Design an enzyme around this catalytic site. Structure first.
Site, PDB file in Angstrom:
ATOM      1  CG  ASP A 141      -1.890  -1.051   1.373  1.00 47.30           C
ATOM      2  OD1 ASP A 141      -2.534  -1.129   2.441  1.00 47.30           O
ATOM      3  OD2 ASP A 141      -2.053  -1.855   0.436  1.00 47.30           O
ATOM      4  CD  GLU A 170     -11.051  -2.416   2.936  1.00 44.06           C
ATOM      5  OE1 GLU A 170      -9.915  -2.052   2.530  1.00 44.06           O
ATOM      6  OE2 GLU A 170     -11.303  -3.594   3.286  1.00 44.06           O
ATOM      7  CE1 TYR A 218      -8.559  -6.027   1.365  1.00 40.78           C
ATOM      8  CE2 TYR A 218      -9.129  -4.088   0.114  1.00 40.78           C
ATOM      9  CZ  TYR A 218      -8.714  -4.666   1.286  1.00 40.78           C
ATOM     10  OH  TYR A 218      -8.455  -3.867   2.388  1.00 40.78           O
TER      11      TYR A 218
END
Ligand SMILES: O=S(=O)(O)[C@]1(CNC2CCCCC2)C[C@@H](O)[C@@H](O)C1
Length: 658
Positions: free
Chosen positions: A232, A503, A615
């Site tokens: 990230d 999220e 994800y």
């Protein structure tokens, strides 16, 4: 060339099969290629598929093996005690187990090349490792080889690493076949790639997939194209997109939706060893976490993403500064000039850079690309490239010049080192994207931007309202626009979590009724409901019946267009595991019309419980199939960093799920 050996229909049931007589006298020269089509839906924890060994007493470390783990890892060992060589090469998350109820035929190709001294492994058309060595060990030159084995390695006359599975075809060649040749071997893949190493983005890594079905029937996907390994931000990351006009059969060459040019787009093999794997590009600006919606009014497609200034990520972003000064109703982007220790400037109407201390305009302006102009003319900075030539990560100027951007390290004027949300739009359904614009702050002057929830925004059926979910400490912050994304307002929904990565993704259950499902720190997926078209939100509830880890994982969610079992259906995508990001499932829920409650009735396993799933993105294709684009690896595990081509796309039908 022809295989010196070719056999098939080998059942591996924890009992080695000896093929020494068929193979050993034909091993010739120092280069070999092994081609193996195999299934393994119930593998042991560690097992050998193929072995060549010295089987005699006193030589138990003289063997070549091709092995796999129940994690999906593939690897080889090449060992010769007399030569002092013990090579071990492997990569996690290289295999498929099952697809639609059936064991997947994996296609494995291993090339042992003496001329280039390189060992290269391909699985399912993907190069998973290629290692060059100083001292090459030909697999047929291992001291005293006298056994060739399937489903085990023979050491001192005993079977080791016993395998469960089936080798449906194995071929051996006395040649290192070329990459070109490898590409011609017929595959039986259950997946396809949209983004991949070596494509137009020139990123070697991808993360954070999205999918969205446009009104034309075109399916659009966005993704983080990640250059500095899979880390990230801080890093170099751009947002790429690709679309399919044929229900996901084929995909367009990717373009960028959002990009920076302070660092070169480099295809780099990021180090995976325990000393260097945390190497991280630390001087680049980046985008991260994108989300897409289509607006019925304008017909525009809208994409949002987080923006990170040079060297900034969510770990070091200033949490107490929006980066905007609010002056009489308006929000102006603050700038700090080289030499100053504070932010003495703002960007006002027409891009004018205004000195806040003298209350006068400068001769600098910011253009629509957030580039710096002086007296109308483009300032430049020198671009950076990265390399590991010195044994550590180096970021250095490469002699190329690019437009000076306020998000850059080398810029004369720099934005506040915090996180922002930007928006871009497309008027041609993803064929090209507009220059991004920053959204306004929604939580005041002294709060960093909220974090965009990756995936889909929500276009409400019976209005032109658009919603993008975001999260921050203590709340979900929904961004709502009723005018095609020209203006935005927030709707805050408290959540009983301190600094959770919450999220969230939404489905419209029925007209004006939105259910948002979201990641938590509790091991359970949570949800809340608006009956307001997003104006106000219910208390938080939890889905009992799906497990996540303590840290949680993104969950994607759609409302299916067709009835299932005579009821309205919602489909969730998520790992279902309390241990790691694995055991991917689609979960079909049927809506009880009496209270808008959902009975989670069917669970479809994407692959083995032990195989990686992180994800994900799901969308109903126009032909009513379900498309799933997902990270097929454990994106939390510190063992599975920096893997290429693990974001993969599959096509499923409802009957597969039920
Ligand atoms: O109903 S929408 O919100 O416009 C959307 C698309 N619906 C069509 C309906 C007809 C079949 C294909 C899917 C669902 C979301 O998951 C986005 O893909 C957009």
């Amino acid at each position: 060339i022809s295989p010196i050996f070719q056999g098939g229909s080998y059942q591996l049931n924890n009992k080695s099969i000896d093929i020494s007589s068929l193979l050993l006298d034909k091993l010739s020269g120092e280069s070999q290629t092994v081609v193996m089509k195999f299934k393994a839906d119930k593998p042991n924890s560690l097992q050998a598929l193929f072995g060549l060994s010295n089987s005699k007493a006193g030589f138990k470390n003289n063997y070549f093996s091709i092995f796999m783990r129940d994690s999906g890892e593939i690897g080889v060992e090449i060992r010769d005690a007399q030569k002092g060589i013990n090579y071990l090469f492997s990569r996690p998350a290289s295999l498929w187990g099952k697809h639609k109820g059936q064991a997947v035929e994996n296609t494995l190709v291993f090339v042992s090349d003496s001329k280039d001294k390189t060992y290269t492994m391909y699985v399912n058309g993907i190069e998973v490792f290629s290692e060059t060595v100083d001292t090459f060990l030909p697999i047929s030159n291992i001291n005293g080889i006298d056994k060739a084995t399937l489903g085990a390695v023979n050491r001192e006359g005993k079977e080791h690493y016993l395998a469960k599975g089936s080798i449906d075809e194995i071929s051996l060649f006395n040649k290192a076949i070329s990459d070109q040749e490898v590409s011609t071997i017929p595959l039986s893949n259950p997946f396809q790639l949209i983004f991949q190493s070596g494509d137009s983005t020139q990123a070697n890594y991808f993360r954070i997939p999205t999918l969205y079905t446009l009104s034309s029937g075109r399916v659009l996907s966005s993704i983080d194209a990640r250059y500095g390994g899979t880390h990230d931000s801080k890093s170099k990351i751009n947002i790429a997109t690709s679309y399919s006009d044929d229900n996901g059969k084929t995909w367009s060459e990717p373009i960028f939706a959002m990009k920076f040019n302070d660092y070169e787009e480099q295809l780099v093999y990021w180090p995976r060893d325990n000393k260097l794997k945390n190497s991280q590009i630390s001087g680049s600006a980046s985008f991260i976490d994108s989300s897409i919606v289509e607006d019925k009014k304008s017909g525009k497609t809208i994409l949002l993403a987080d923006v990170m200034p040079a060297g900034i990520g969510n770990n070091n972003a200033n949490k107490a500064d929006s980066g905007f000064k609010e002056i009489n109703g308006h929000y102006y982007l603050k700038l700090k000039k080289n030499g100053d220790n504070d932010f003495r400037y703002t960007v006002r109407e027409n891009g004018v850079v205004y000195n806040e201390t003298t209350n006068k305009p400068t001769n600098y302006t910011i253009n629509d690309k957030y580039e710096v102009l002086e007296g109308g003319k483009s300032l430049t900075v020198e671009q950076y490239s990265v390399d590991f030539d010195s044994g550590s990560l180096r970021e250095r100027h490469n002699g190329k010049q690019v437009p000076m951007n306020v998000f850059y390290k080398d810029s004369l004027f720099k934005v506040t080192p915090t996180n922002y949300i930007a928006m871009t739009t497309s008027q041609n359904r993803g064929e090209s994207w507009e220059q991004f614009k920053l959204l306004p702050p929604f939580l005041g002057e002294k709060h960093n931007g909220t974090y965009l929830c990756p995936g889909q925004g929500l276009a409400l059926k019976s209005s032109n309202r658009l919603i993008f979910a975001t999260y921050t400490s203590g709340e979900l912050t929904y961004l709502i626009s009723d005018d095609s994304g020209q203006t935005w307002k927030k709707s805050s929904a408290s959540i009983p979590f301190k600094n959770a990565t919450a999220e969230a993704q939404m489905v419209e259950l029925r007209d004006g009724v939105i259910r948002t499902f979201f990641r938590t720190t509790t091991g359970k997926i949570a949800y809340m409901t608006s009956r307001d078209s997003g104006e106000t939100w219910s208390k938080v509830s939890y889905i009992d019946g799906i497990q996540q880890t303590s840290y949680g994982t993104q969950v994607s969610a759609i409302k299916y267009s067709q009835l299932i079992d005579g009821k309205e259906a919602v489909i969730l995508s998520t790992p279902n595991s309390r241990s790691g990001r694995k055991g991917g499932q689609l979960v079909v829920g049927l809506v009880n019309k009496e209270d808008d409650s959902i009975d989670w009735k069917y669970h479809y396993g994407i692959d083995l419980p032990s195989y990686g799933y992180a994800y994900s993105a799901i969308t109903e294709l126009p032909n009513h199939h379900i498309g799933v684009l997902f990270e097929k690896y454990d994106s939390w595990s510190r063992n599975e960093l920096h893997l290429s081509n693990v974001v993969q796309y599959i096509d499923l039908e409802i009957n597969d799920l039920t």
